[PDB]
Amino acid sequence: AEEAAASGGLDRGLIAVGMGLAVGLAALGTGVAQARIGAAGVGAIAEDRSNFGTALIFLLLPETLVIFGLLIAFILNGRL
Amino acid sequence: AEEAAASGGLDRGLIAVGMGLAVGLAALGTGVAQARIGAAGVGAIAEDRSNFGTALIFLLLPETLVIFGLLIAFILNGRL
Amino acid sequence: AEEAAASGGLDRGLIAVGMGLAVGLAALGTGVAQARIGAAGVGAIAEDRSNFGTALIFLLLPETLVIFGLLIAFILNGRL
Amino acid sequence: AEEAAASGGLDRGLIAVGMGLAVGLAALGTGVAQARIGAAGVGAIAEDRSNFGTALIFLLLPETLVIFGLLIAFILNGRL
Amino acid sequence: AEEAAASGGLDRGLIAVGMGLAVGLAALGTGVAQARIGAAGVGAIAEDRSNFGTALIFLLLPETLVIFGLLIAFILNGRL
Amino acid sequence: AEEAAASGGLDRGLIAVGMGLAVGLAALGTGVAQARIGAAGVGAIAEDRSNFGTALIFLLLPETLVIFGLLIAFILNGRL
Amino acid sequence: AEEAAASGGLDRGLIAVGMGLAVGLAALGTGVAQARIGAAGVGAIAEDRSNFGTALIFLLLPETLVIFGLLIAFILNGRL
Amino acid sequence: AEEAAASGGLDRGLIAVGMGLAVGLAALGTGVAQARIGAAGVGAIAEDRSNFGTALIFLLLPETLVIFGLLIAFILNGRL
Amino acid sequence: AEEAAASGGLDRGLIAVGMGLAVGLAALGTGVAQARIGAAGVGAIAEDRSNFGTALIFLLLPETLVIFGLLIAFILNGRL
Amino acid sequence: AEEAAASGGLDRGLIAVGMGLAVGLAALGTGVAQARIGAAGVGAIAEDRSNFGTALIFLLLPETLVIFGLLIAFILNGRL
Amino acid sequence: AEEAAASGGLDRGLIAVGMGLAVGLAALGTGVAQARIGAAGVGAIAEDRSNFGTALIFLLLPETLVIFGLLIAFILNGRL
Amino acid sequence: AEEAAASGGLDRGLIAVGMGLAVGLAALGTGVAQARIGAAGVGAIAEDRSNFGTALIFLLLPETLVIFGLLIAFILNGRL
Amino acid sequence: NPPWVKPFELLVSFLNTPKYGTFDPTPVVPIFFPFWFGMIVGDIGYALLFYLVGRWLSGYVKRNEPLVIDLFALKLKPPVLAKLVYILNWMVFWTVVWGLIYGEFFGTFLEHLGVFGTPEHPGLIPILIHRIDTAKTANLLILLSVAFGVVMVFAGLILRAYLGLKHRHMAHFWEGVGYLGGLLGILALAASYLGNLQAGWLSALMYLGFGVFLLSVVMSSIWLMIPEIFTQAGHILSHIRIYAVGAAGGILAGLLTDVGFAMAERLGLIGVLLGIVVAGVLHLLILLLTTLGHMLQPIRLIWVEFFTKFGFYEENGRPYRPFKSVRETQ
Amino acid sequence: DDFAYLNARVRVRRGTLLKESFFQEALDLSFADFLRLLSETVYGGELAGQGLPDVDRAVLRTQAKLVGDLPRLVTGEAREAVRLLLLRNDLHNLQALLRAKATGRPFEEVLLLPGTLREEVWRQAYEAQDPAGMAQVLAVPGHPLARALRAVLRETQDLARVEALLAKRFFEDVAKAAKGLDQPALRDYLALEVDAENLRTAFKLQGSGLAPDAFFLKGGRFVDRVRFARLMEGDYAVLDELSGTPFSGLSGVRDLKALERGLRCVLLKEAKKGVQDPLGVGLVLAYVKEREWEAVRLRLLARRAYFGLPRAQVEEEVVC
CA–CA dist J15, N221 (Å, integer): 55
Residue D1 lies in a domain: no
Same domain? N202 vs N271: yes
Residue to mutate among N179, N186, N188, with most L CBs inside 10 A, is N188
Between F7, F49, F70, which is nearest M201 by CB? Answer: F7
CB pairs under 8 A between F and G: 133
Instruction: Give K-chain residues touching L44 at CB under 8 angstroms.
Output: 45
Answer whether C68 sits within 8 Å of B73, measured CB to CB. Answer: no
- Do the chains G and M touch each other, judged by at least 3 C-beta pairs below 8 angstroms? yes
- Chains linked to N by 3 or more Cβ pairs within 8 Å: A, B, C, D, E, F, G, H, J, K, L
Alpha-carbon distance M65 to M74, whole Å?
10
Question: Is E31's CB within 8 Å of F62's CB?
Answer: yes
What residues of chain N lie within 8 A of the CB of E61, using their CB? Answer: none
Is residue E3 one of the residues assigned to a domain? no
Query: How many domains does the structure of chain N reveal?
Result: 3
F62 secondary structure, DSSP code = G
Substitution target in B30, B51, B75 with the highest count of C β-carbons within 10 Å is B30
Same domain, yes or no: N113 and N166: yes
In chain G, the number of structural domains is 1
DSSP class per residue in M246-304: HHHHHHHHHHSGGGTTT--STTS-GGGGGTTHHHHHHHHHHHHHHHTTGGGHHHHHHHH
Residues N172 and N199 in one domain: no
Q: Pick the residue of M232, M243, M307 with the most G CBs within 10 A to test the interface with G by mutation.
A: M307
> In CATH, what number is assigned to the domain containing residue N91?
1.20.1690.10
Q: How far is G9 from chain E (nearest CA, A)?
A: 10
B40 and N276: CB-CB below 8 Å? Answer: yes
Cross-chain residue pair D61–C34, CB shorter than 8 Å: yes
Cα gap F47→F24, rounded to integer Å: 35
Mapping DSSP onto H, E and C, the string for N92-115 reads HHHHHHHHHHHCCCCCCCCCCCCC
Chains G and F touch (3+ CB pairs under 8 A): yes
Give partners of H (≥3 CB pairs < 8 A): G, I, M, N
Chains C and D share 3 or more Cβ pairs within 8 Å: yes
Q: Residue F17 and residue N251: Cα distance in Å, rounded?
A: 77
Q: Which of A39, A46, A47 sits opposite N277 (nearest CB)?
A: A39
Residue K2 CA from chain centroid, whole number: 21
Q: What are the chain L neighbours of A60 within 8 Å (beta carbons)?
A: none
What DSSP state is assigned to residue N67? T
Q: Which of N181, N197, N216 is the last residue of a domain?
A: N181
- Minimal-distance CA residue of chain B relative to C22: B24
Q: Is residue L3 part of a domain?
A: no
Cβ–Cβ of E31/G36 closer than 8 Å? Answer: no
Cβ(D26)–Cβ(D65) below 8 Å: yes
**CB distance from M316 to chain G under 8 Å?**
yes
CB contact under 8 A, K38 and L19: no
Chains that touch A (3 or more CB pairs under 8 A): B, K, L, N
Find the helix packing angle between F64-76 and E9-47, rounded to 10°. Answer: 160
Whether G1 is in a domain gets the answer no
How many alpha carbons lie under 13 Å from residue N291 in its C-beta half-sphere?
25
Task: Nearest by CB to L3, from A25, A32, A75: name it.
Answer: A75
Domain edge (last residue) among N143, N159, N181:
N181
Provide, as residue numbers in chain N, all residues whose Cβ is less than 8 Å from the Cβ of K46. Answer: 187-188, 191
The answer as to whether A51 is a domain residue is yes
Query: Is-contact I80 I4, C-beta < 8 A?
Result: no
Judging contact as 3 or more Cβ pairs under 8 Å, the answer for L and F is no
DSSP, residue by residue, F9-46: SHHHHHHHHHHHHHHHHHHHHHHHHHHHHHHHHHHHHH
**Does A contact E via 3+ CB–CB distances below 8 Å?**
no
Question: Using CA atoms, how far apart are residues G9 and B55, in angstroms rounded to an integer?
Answer: 60
Tell me which H or E stretch contains B36: helix B10-47
- For CA atoms I64, I67, I72, I73, the dihedral sign is positive
CB pairs under 8 A between L and N: 6
Mutate: best of B19, B30, B34, B45, partner A, most A CBs <10 A:
B19
- The subunits that touch chain D, with at least 3 C-beta pairs less than 8 Å apart, are C, E, N
CA angle A76, A77, B1 (to 5 degrees): 155
Tell me which residue in G15, G19, G44 faces F43 most closely, judged by beta carbons: G44
B63 is a domain residue: yes
Q: How far is G17 from G7, CA to CA, in rounded Å?
A: 15
Query: CB atoms < 10 A from the CB of H6, how many?
Result: 19
Dihedral, CA of residue M22, residue M24, residue M25 and residue M29, to nearest 10: -130
DSSP assignment of M167-223, as one string? HT-HHHHHHHHHTHHHHHHHHHHHHHHHSSSS-SSSSSSSHHHHHHHHHTTTTTS--
* Distance linking the first and last C-alpha atoms of chain F: 10
Contact check, Cβ <8 Å, C20/D22: yes
Residue K2 lies in a domain: no
Residues of chain J numbered 13-72 and touching chain I (CB < 8 Å):
13-15, 17-18, 21-22, 24-26, 28-30, 32-37, 40-41, 44, 47-48, 51, 54-55, 58, 61-62, 64-65, 68, 72
User: How open is the CA angle N127-N133-N134, to the nearest 5 degrees?
Assistant: 70
Question: Looking at the partner chain, which of I2, I4, I49 has a beta carbon nearest the beta carbon of J54?
Answer: I49
CB L1 within 8 A of CB A73: no
Q: How close B60 gets to chain A, by Cα (Å)?
A: 12
Q: Which chains touch E (3 or more CB pairs under 8 A)?
A: D, F, G, N
User: CB within 8 A of J9, min separation 6: which ones?
Assistant: I4, I6, I7, J1, J2, J80, K11
Q: Where are the alpha helices (H) located in chain A, listed in sequence order?
A: 10-47, 52-76
**N186 shares its domain with N269:** yes
Q: How close B67 comes to chain A (CA, Å)?
A: 11
CB atoms within 10 A of CB N233: 9
| Cα–Cα distance measured from residue E72 to residue B79, given in angstroms and rounded to the nearest whole number | 40
Please give the residue of chain A at the shortest CA–CA distance from N270.
A47
Region of N252 (left: φ > 0; alpha: ψ -120 to 50; beta: rest) is left
Q: Assess if residue G2 is contained within a domain.
A: no
Domain of E25 in residue numbering reads as: 8-80
N35 close to N50: Cβ distance less than 8 angstroms: yes
Largest CA distance in chain I: 60
Burial class from Cβ neighbours inside 10 Å (0-12, 13-18, 19+) for residue A69 reads buried
3-state DSSP helix/strand/coil percent for chain C, to nearest 5? 80, 0, 20
Distances (CA, A) of N269 to N185, N221, N246, N266, N273: 11, 20, 12, 5, 7
Say whether the D–J interface has 3 or more Cβ pairs within 8 Å: no
Counted residue by residue, chain I has a size of: 80
Q: Which residues contact M142 (CB under 8 A, 6 or more apart)?
A: H71, H75, M244, M247, M248
Interface test with N, best of C34, C42, C58 (most N CBs within 10 A): C42
Q: Which residues in chain A touch residue N184, judged by CB atoms under 8 angstroms apart?
A: 40, 43
In whole angstroms, give the CA distance from residue I39 to residue J32.
Answer: 9
| Residues on chain N bordering chain K, Cβ-to-Cβ distance under 8 angstroms | 179, 182, 184, 187-188, 191, 218-221
Nearest to A43 by CA among N189, M219, M103: N189
Experimental method: cryo-EM
Resolution of the solved structure (Å):
9.5
Polymer length in residues for chain L? 80
User: How far is the first Cα of chain E from the last one, in angstroms, to the nearest whole number?
Assistant: 12
| Helix or strand (DSSP H, E) at L7 | none
Domain range enclosing N257: 182-279
Rg of chain K's alpha carbons, rounded to an integer? 18
**Chain N residues with a Cβ under 8 Å from any Cβ in chain C:** 4, 7-8, 11-15, 17, 275, 278-279, 283
Residues just before a chain gap in chain G (C–N exceeding 2.5 Å) are: none
CATH code of the domain containing B20:
1.20.20.10
